[PDB]
Symmetry: D2
Subunit: 386 residues, 4 copies
């Protein structure tokens, strides 16, 4: 009955179950968790691994000797539990120095500091075995129009990622980068606000094959966009390196609800897509147990993330295996969508009079697409009414 195992590759950020509940209007409602206890608790729930910002693991300002002590304790908990660390990232948003951004801060000395803080953590990530290094530029942006020349900012952003790519290739590291877009919050508008803007930007980097995207369910939904469509475009481009799963109720602040909450039907189509495209990366939950909860609610919320993925996986697999659905997909011509429009080539298309001169536009127009029957079959499967 929907029990996770480490083979399902579910991972969690230390900052998710460790969120103390401080929001812009209220104090923390929970005490801080020791990273070691989070690793142990998540292993008991069936998680595969954890992820971290540098500052989640090593408190800002630590001497190099305290740094080594923090890493050693952490490594011991990984060894004790079998937990992996597939992804790491840099905190370039909490400290006041980053108030105008990290890579695109107007102050050049802050931009250099941001790069040095990142490189330091790339080394640590590689040491712990991370395969993906995520960058969320949460402070790269503006509240007003004149504060940021965006063309210069994009030059500075390209400069920073190119330097990171030069660094990992010169060190011989097997790590790739994933850019995580978000349209706004905490800045009024954030640079590279959606999956598409991030994909387009990567194509202008010096070594584009090193960079992909880490889309988050709730972030694309904060722009009212269709998250499974955006994932499909990322898979089509070959760039889905990692994914952040959670829930979001529409266009408002970033709620980071547990996965399956928010838009349930979008969650169903997302799982259907990830499973049928053979996505094999981590299923990472970037979520925040609501600040109404005590510690038992934190672990129930985390367990719910995994449970909902596994239920949706079962319902999507049943949907695609149902002969009646396979019939309906052909009735709606999904098979014809997958066939080339003009494999016969341009010249044959131009001479083909059934494509224009003799095309019966009124007969083609009358054909129904039968999409509503297909979508009700999908609803019946999601709800277990089939």
């Amino acid at each position: 009955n929907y029990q996770p195992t480490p083979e399902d590759r579910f991972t969690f950020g230390l900052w998710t179950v460790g969120w103390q509940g401080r929001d812009p209007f209220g104090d923390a409602t929970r005490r801080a968790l020791d990273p070691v206890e989070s690793v142990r608790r998540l292993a008991e729930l069936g998680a595969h691994g954890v992820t971290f910002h540098d500052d989640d693991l090593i408190p800002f300002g630590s001497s190099d000797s305290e740094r080594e002590e923090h890493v050693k304790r952490f490594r011991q908990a990984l060894d004790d539990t079998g937990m992996k660390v597939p992804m790491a990232t840099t905190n370039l948003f909490t400290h006041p120095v980053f108030k105008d951004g990290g890579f695109t801060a107007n102050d050049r000395d802050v931009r250099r500091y941001a790069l040095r803080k990142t490189i330091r953590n790339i080394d640590l990530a590689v040491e712990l075995g991370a395969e993906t290094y995520v960058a969320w530029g949460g402070r790269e942006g503006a509240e007003s129009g004149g504060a940021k020349d965006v063309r210069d900012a994009l030059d500075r952003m390209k400069e920073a990622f190119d330097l990171l790519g030069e660094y990992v290739t010169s060190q011989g590291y097997d790590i790739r980068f994933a850019i995580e877009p978000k349209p706004n919050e905490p800045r009024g508008d954030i640079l590279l606000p959606t999956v598409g803007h991030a994909l387009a930007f990567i194509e202008r980097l010096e070594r584009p094959e090193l960079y992909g995207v880490n889309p988050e369910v709730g972030h694309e939904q904060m722009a009212g966009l269709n998250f499974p469509h955006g994932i499909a475009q990322a898979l089509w481009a070959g760039k889905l390196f990692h994914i952040d799963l959670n829930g979001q109720n529409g266009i408002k602040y970033d709620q980071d609800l547990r996965f399956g909450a928010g838009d349930l039907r979008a969650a169903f189509w997302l799982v259907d897509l990830l499973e049928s495209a053979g996505y094999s990366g981590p299923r990472h939950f970037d979520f925040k147990p609501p600040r109404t909860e005590d510690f038992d609610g934190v672990w129930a919320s985390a367990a719910g993330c995994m449970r909902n993925y596994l239920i949706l996986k079962e319902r999507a697999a049943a949907f695609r295996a149902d002969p009646e659905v396979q019939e309906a997909l052909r009735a709606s011509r999904l098979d014809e969508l997958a066939r080339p429009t003009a494999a016969d080539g341009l010249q044959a298309l131009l001479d083909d009079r059934s494509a224009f001169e003799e095309f019966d536009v009124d007969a083609a127009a009358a054909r129904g697409m039968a999409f509503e029957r297909l979508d009700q079959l999908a609803m019946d499967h999601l709800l277990g009414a089939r």
Copy 2:
């Protein structure tokens, strides 16, 4: 006092001033305009040129002989007035045959028909002197998740644009393509919903240099995105081939208000950016005079589009020329944003102890950015209080 001339390159679609006022809840409130009278009226107002869909100019279903008569009348009005036709496009959305799309319809025969209808109009556009050919895939999309495999749809979309590019290069035509994104309406979700998704898609075409974007103010704002930021990214990529100007009040149906209505401060920053980047393409208005108006209101609304652009152009130029603003831009370190982060290279950055070991993070954090004073100077200029 803000009088346009053809040197300002203002253009209008035939379908804008010709919109009869039919909306999803109501009949037309205005009679149809003859394209010839629209060209004459727009020339009197100071417009530079007009744009058209094939079906605006040649009623759907016309015999080749009626086609020639429509083009000849149109060409005579252009000659009589001096009006240009810089852009043309295809209607792949009104006729019922296109109800599931044109290039990405599930039915293969509709996709072939869509391509033939487009190619036919590309020839006409070239004959009339158009330099840009726009594609707005308004029906490419879905209302439900199972109706459209988006990876196959993107294959079909790439297939169609690659064929169009093969066609124009084999004919030797000097015309480029611009993809116009829109996130939704009339489909529940439209493929390539934003500037960024369109930019990313173009990089996967066989001949990317032939394709750019035609962003529309209101369309990016229907996803709550910052339109001047998205334009900056398109300019940075070298892809801003054309632009649709209008107004939109936030996230709702596509209002297509006259330019300057909707988000006035975004209009100001857009004009500032287009003028300071030296955009030299048409300033095209894709707007709809509200259906409350009679024909005198149609021409007042069209005149307002141009008037508002010219007022904003004057206020943006004054803002950038004001020595106090130039001082404030330096106070906020816009100059430093334009300087490379690490022209000294990766190795120098790694050995630079002022970038990390000796960086005074608390001193840098205390520096104010002075953005609010800059933004109030921008407000004062917009309002003519300077």
Copy 3:
């Protein structure tokens, strides 16, 4: 297996299954349905009744003799099928005369005409047995700020509804009015945009007991509001006279998807609320079969509306009957929410030192609310994983 019967009180507007598929960018994809055939087809599917605008039933402009012929044919189909007509409404939005509104048009003669057209249909509605008369002011609004003084418009709106109330009471009719709010579309902003604004307005009418609300799922969601919360407020006020059920994916144009599509979890909480509050009015579907569909898709979409309501009704009833859920509701103190805060009165509260001086704020703060476990039980029930 989720078969409707007329006892479930499902009703449909003639304009829903009869929508021809004309949207702002495209022609009709389906021929017009005879109202008589819609009544027969809906009776076969298990519907309880139908609703109509005057202009759905009697084509605009009909002579009084054609009017009588249309009503007689309609009445015969009702008799033949047993279908009821519980609600009727007036079309004050399609004809061009209504382009600036009906009750709040700036032109006084249009406002008088709007009232006469309404009164005429109130008589017909009463004759056919309607119990509720709906008013959707779709054209009452503005695209620009100076076009409409809203205080004067609200005076005109109060004037119109007061006259309608004087009319029904002077005729001795047993009919009540329900105002249907919508925030925008087709006007840029519509007056009384949400349930709350409509409830507040009713309290200023001369005879408030005659007026309630007819909320629509998709309309409150076009403002990003929680529809079950808004229904709860309407029930709390005693004003939920009627309801329009459908589906909507977030903040965009009014999609009018079949009920159960859009926000599925909101549909679940809505059904839970209607059923547990004992709402006994019609379950009315105001939806539009997508224009991709032929006539078989129209009836499948209509059947899906009812099927989804009945599935959700079953899952909500199971949720509330589950002893584990009843336990969890007490764990989250839903029982305590239902108990008065201070039945002991103001003076006892002021003298109660356990309410302030001796209140242990830190102990109360540490208590978890256990909401995530409750919400996962609700998810499990919705998905049939319980």
Copy 4:
């Protein structure tokens, strides 16, 4: 040149200029301000007065003797500067005990504590001369459907406000209450989410004349609603007791930008309305200087709030005084909107054949409303191009 004086009645919350810059992703960027220094600085800028939460003035947990010391220092700064305190409010959102709300917390003992904490501050407010007591129920709400029975919550909310009203009338205090709506943040959905919902709720209180609304520009815009329309409805009801002015760019997190930023044209229509309706309450700024700013930017941002109000006031007054605008208002029949539809009464309307039988619907339909010319005159005035 747009210099404020205390006669303009501009007020500021202590928490606005005192916001330290802590957001959900970052630490404070500014040190705390002493309330005494904020009062002095705001008096120098031309403010009329300040407002406070209990916890802004008296740190949570203070002994009664420290309480008296805080009030005395504060009162001395008011005396020294001439600053007034027209409004006060209660912090029922920051402390963890309020994580599930104050008046509608599920735990009864928290609800009693919330009431006692409020009553204590009502006494203080009266002592300092406040005329309005604001309630913003920021924690009254839910993230999930089963956590909160909204009908019971509204019972608890009515219970709390009725008790407050019994308290002020039994003490003989001349103070009125204003409810401040907000649709979401920090809860997933907040009870009474808009002006309309708050107006409707007040009509069910035992003593409705004691309660009005305190709408905030940005909060109604977070639901995509037209703020000047919502203010007009509040004025029409006689309930606009207070107003929070600021700026907001569309549907996203609550930005609290300085007034005039965000939607500039909505700011213009708001000022036009407040000034022409003779609103005489405080012009209160609930805004947050962005966390990019140092203390000089804080005071520049505060000064900008007042400057923008005064510029907009001048442009709106010029607009309404312009004879050409007065002509255009008559051309668009704003005069006719203000005249009763049917002062002749119901029976005369029914016998008036020019209202229906002989009404020339096609002639009335052809009349243009001339709204676009009016709106361009309004644009010209806003921009100082007239």
